[PDB]
Write a protein that binds this DNA or RNA. Sequence first.
RNA 1: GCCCUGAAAAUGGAUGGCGCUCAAGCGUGUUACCUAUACUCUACCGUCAGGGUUGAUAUGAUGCCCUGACGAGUAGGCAGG
Length: 52
Amino acid sequence: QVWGSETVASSKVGYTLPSHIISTSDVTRIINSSEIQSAIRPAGQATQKRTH
RNA sequence: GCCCUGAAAAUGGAUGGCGCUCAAGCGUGUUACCUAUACUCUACCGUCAGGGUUGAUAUGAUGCCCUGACGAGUAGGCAGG
Ligand SMILES: [Mg+2]
Ligand SMILES: [Mg+2]
Ligand SMILES: [Mg+2]
């Protein structure tokens, strides 16, 4: 009642809860999604060999 | 050309000094040699630039790592402590 919900308006006059700018906070799961993984090229070594 | 005369100033006095006369002087030529915080190569510190790497089960993605170049400073500006 005090802060409102998706189906209940907050008792505060004209107030609504802040909106998220990102759907989820786990970016690793987003990267591991099939859509992203099927569009990227294979990675490297994480520590480049010294050639000279 | 060199040397000499012309050429007289006040404390004692300065090719830097000693000293030097086929010079250790003057003109010229040929080599060797000495040494700057400059140049070449290497290491380390920092700065800037271009790149690699989120995959869980081990910790900093402002993380870790690869490559190249650069570094004087009053007045003054900015940044990290
Ligand atoms: Mg001579
Ligand atoms: Mg030097
Ligand atoms: Mg400086």
